[PDB]
Amino acid sequence: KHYGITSPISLASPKEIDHIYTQKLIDAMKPFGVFEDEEELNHRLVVLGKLNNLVKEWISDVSESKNLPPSVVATVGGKIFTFGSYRLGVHTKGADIDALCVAPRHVERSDFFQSFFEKLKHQDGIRNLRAVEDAFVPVIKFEFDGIEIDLVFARLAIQTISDNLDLRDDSRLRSLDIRCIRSLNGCRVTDEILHLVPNKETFRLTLRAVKLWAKRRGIYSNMLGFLGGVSWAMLVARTCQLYPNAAASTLVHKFFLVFSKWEWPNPVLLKQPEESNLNLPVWDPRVNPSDRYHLMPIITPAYPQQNSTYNVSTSTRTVMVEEFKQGLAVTDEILQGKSDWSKLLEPPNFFQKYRHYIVLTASASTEENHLEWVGLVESKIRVLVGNLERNEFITLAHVNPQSFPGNYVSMWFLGIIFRDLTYDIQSFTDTVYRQANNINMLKEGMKIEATHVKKKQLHHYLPAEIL
Ligand SMILES: Nc1ncnc2c1ncn2[C@@H]1O[C@H](COP(=O)(O)OP(=O)(O)OP(=O)(O)O)C[C@H]1O
Ligand SMILES: [Ca+2]
């Protein structure tokens, strides 16, 4: 009948001024690079066309190393799907593209990472080729004519790949390698969200706004314990179901209304979960004590449903809840004509709202040396936060998920609220090198350093943004 697990909050439709507020929203948003050009969209279209054709090509090549009847190798399909930002149609200028390669019976996960990997290496505009198959979802990353692409692979147990395939079917998962299942998950979730939303135009616009808000406001980063794309996509989709008729302007407002009242850890669900005979691991605190401890459950709607915000510590949950409420306050003003959309988008006073900080400085000798190391460090920051949260005297450890520059360097800043932390820090810096050694990764010239700084002393470290 309606969409979500609950009947909606209101069926109110917009009047002339709500349309006015929406236009102002679009106009506030343009200068931030949120909307791509005809040229850009088309470029993505052209690049993706090739990739697809390569995949259709390569799935034919492999199909002849196995000598199938030539009236079948022709029938053999192959397809590329997108998911994430780009597929949601809300990606920004410079956005990567998350893509999924779907092959038939005769193509093994082993093939994609050796032979098709060899295929890409040779193609004209492909740079930065690299496999990461140890990773949670096995991916091949590259840039194709300047588009960052994160290509992921799945092997289905069918003969062909109907150019109009449909991944939403749960029967597909039956008897599949957990590797193949996690690989289908991306599309499955993305496509599920689009289907669980009553209006796609208003969903997208609202999503674009909310994501901009999150970024500008310093709470966009799954890594560093905040939320990423799929999470914001899901929250905006839940809001859309509750107000199936609103304008984006209203939807951005209601979003803040809804998710500042929201009683955590009530989970955010987009559909009524069904059970299957499939018996896969699933988020469920009613059978998993580990799940009880997730602080801000935002649950993926495609089977098997998982939480997407495992990374959220208490501090980040607390920081975000405050931001939610700030959004509610500013949007109360905006929908009355008393404030402009820009006020919603102002950066927060991070470098003044705290009495103490931690400057997390990370250094390397060469460029390739830097990028890699910065990778490692950044993936470990959530640990320092963790240490700090277990500290008796600490009330909040707030990481700003934007690194800055200053030989190659990068720094992050944590803000702290109390009720001498050099050894919460040591154990962190120690832990980083220590684990860098475990992977035989730490090369000379790669330093990491963390100094506690009072506010009064901050300006010695504050970089270029001092404006
Ligand atoms: N918990 C999850 N469940 C299902 N899919 C996920 C999950 N986490 C990440 N993904 C998927 O992996 C891909 C890349 O992640 P991500 O880049 O954070 O999202 P996104 O929607 O593409 O937004 P951005 O590209 O960062 O602007 C696309 C996304 O749908
Ligand atoms: Ca992406």
Side-chain angles (χ1 to χ4, degrees):
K1 185 47 186 181
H2 54 278
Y3 279 88
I5 47 186
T6 80
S7 71
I9 283 171
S10 165
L11 295 189
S13 305
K15 294 290 283 181
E16 278 78 4
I17 193 182
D18 305 307
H19 295 304
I20 292 198
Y21 289 144
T22 300
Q23 187 68 40
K24 298 272 191 66
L25 212 214
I26 302 195
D27 297 341
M29 273 185 283
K30 290 216 201 78
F32 290 103
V34 186
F35 301 100
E36 247 186 348
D37 288 341
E38 179 69 353
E39 285 195 2
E40 296 160 329
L41 299 171
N42 276 357
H43 189 55
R44 292 178 187 276
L45 252 31
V46 168
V47 176
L48 278 168
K50 291 148 131 206
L51 227 197
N52 189 58
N53 276 340
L54 297 192
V55 151
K56 276 172 173 281
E57 215 214 284
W58 160 79
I59 290 164
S60 195
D61 296 349
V62 155
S63 162
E64 281 180 352
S65 322
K66 323 297 180 79
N67 288 274
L68 313 192
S71 68
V72 159
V73 186
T75 323
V76 145
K79 185 179 183 185
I80 269 204
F81 291 88
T82 47
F83 55 105
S85 275
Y86 177 76
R87 157 116 278 253
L88 287 172
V90 301
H91 63 281
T92 69
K93 278 180 165 156
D96 62 26
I97 295 196
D98 298 289
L100 165 79
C101 174
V102 169
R105 291 192 210 115
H106 56 72
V107 194
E108 197 96 21
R109 316 204 74 265
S110 51
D111 296 7
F112 170 84
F113 282 90
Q114 52 88 227
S115 70
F116 186 88
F117 187 97
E118 279 307 302
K119 197 159 221 312
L120 301 179
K121 203 173 68 176
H122 289 160
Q123 281 286 328
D124 264 339
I126 294 180
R127 308 303 301 263
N128 235 272
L129 238 199
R130 66 229 142 107
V132 183
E133 33 177 335
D134 64 78
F136 188 67
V137 207
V139 58
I140 295 184
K141 289 185 197 290
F142 56 97
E143 309 179 15
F144 199 176
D145 291 334
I147 299 304
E148 282 173 46
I149 292 187
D150 280 30
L151 180 56
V152 108
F153 181 86
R155 158 194 160 139
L156 291 178
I158 33 178
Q159 174 139 300
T160 83
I161 296 296
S162 158
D163 256 23
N164 74 349
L165 232 204
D166 199 23
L167 299 181
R168 44 172 33 253
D169 182 24
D170 270 24
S171 82
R172 316 220 88 101
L173 298 209
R174 175 164 299 102
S175 303
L176 293 203
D177 188 323
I178 42 165
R179 296 140 98 227
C180 282
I181 293 153
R182 296 211 210 116
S183 286
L184 286 185
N185 195 48
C187 287
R188 293 187 93 226
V189 168
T190 295
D191 287 57
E192 266 291 343
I193 301 179
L194 290 174
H195 295 47
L196 295 168
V197 119
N199 187 320
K200 300 186 182 70
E201 188 170 351
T202 68
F203 169 65
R204 287 187 205 96
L205 190 47
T206 309
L207 225 217
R208 296 176 132 140
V210 179
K211 286 178 77 182
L212 211 204
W213 165 71
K215 297 194 177 82
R216 269 322 228 61
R217 224 77 223 306
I219 63 178
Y220 195 107
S221 175
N222 168 80
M223 171 125 296
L224 293 153
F226 295 98
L227 265 49
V230 204
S231 295
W232 299 113
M234 288 195 274
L235 297 177
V236 170
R238 182 86 251 268
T239 310
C240 288
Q241 297 172 330
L242 288 168
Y243 300 91
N245 293 332
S249 39
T250 298
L251 286 162
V252 172
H253 169 68
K254 289 300 180 176
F255 172 84
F256 295 123
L257 220 213
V258 172
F259 292 108
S260 57
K261 286 173 159 34
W262 190 278
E263 207 157 316
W264 303 114
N266 283 345
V268 182
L269 305 153
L270 298 169
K271 73 186 286 189
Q272 229 323 291
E274 294 194 39
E275 65 180 66
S276 51
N277 42 42
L278 273 176
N279 224 45
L280 289 180
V282 163
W283 188 81
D284 192 343
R286 208 197 102 98
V287 281
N288 277 312
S290 118
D291 296 357
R292 284 211 276 279
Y293 307 144
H294 297 165
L295 303 170
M296 210 171 161
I298 312 182
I299 305 308
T300 266
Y303 183 88
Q305 20 276 324
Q306 305 286 344
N307 187 22
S308 56
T309 58
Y310 172 96
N311 277 350
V312 175
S313 75
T314 94
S315 276
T316 64
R317 194 234 253 134
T318 287
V319 149
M320 276 169 156
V321 158
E322 263 131 42
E323 287 306 327
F324 275 140
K325 294 171 186 171
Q326 247 301 128
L328 178 60
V330 192
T331 54
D332 273 334
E333 292 164 9
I334 298 166
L335 299 190
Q336 275 171 36
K338 302 299 161 47
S339 283
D340 272 314
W341 284 109
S342 72
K343 184 174 160 177
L344 207 227
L345 275 17
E346 296 170 330
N349 282 327
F350 178 83
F351 301 99
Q352 282 104 17
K353 57 189 316 107
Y354 298 131
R355 281 317 241 55
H356 318 258
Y357 292 81
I358 298 182
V359 186
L360 230 218
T361 310
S363 237
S365 27
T366 79
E367 264 222 51
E368 338 92 36
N369 262 29
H370 192 53
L371 207 163
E372 192 197 3
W373 176 234
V374 142
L376 171 60
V377 176
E378 200 213 54
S379 78
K380 298 277 176 275
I381 290 176
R382 216 168 66 255
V383 158
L384 190 232
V385 169
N387 294 5
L388 290 164
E389 290 186 342
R390 276 175 275 104
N391 187 312
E392 183 193 356
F393 299 103
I394 296 189
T395 267
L396 188 81
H398 186 194
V399 79
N400 175 349
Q402 181 173 12
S403 62
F404 300 90
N407 197 11
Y408 304 133
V409 95
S410 303
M411 20 203 294
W412 296 266
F413 298 74
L414 272 89
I416 307 185
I417 302 183
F418 297 115
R419 148 235 300 189
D420 185 293
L421 28 72
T422 73
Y423 285 100
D424 272 284
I425 281 175
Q426 198 63 14
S427 143
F428 166 65
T429 48
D430 297 345
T431 311
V432 182
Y433 293 127
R434 183 273 227 92
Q435 290 188 44
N437 286 332
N438 285 353
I439 15 161
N440 264 261
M441 181 269 170
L442 181 265
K443 309 172 195 63
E444 115 138 32
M446 301 197 322
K447 191 171 192 46
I448 192 195
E449 184 181 348
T451 47
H452 177 199
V453 188
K454 292 197 176 72
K455 178 197 278 187
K456 318 304 176 77
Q457 253 39 57
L458 229 207
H459 63 92
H460 289 331
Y461 300 95
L462 229 36
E465 141 279 309
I466 13 186
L467 285 169

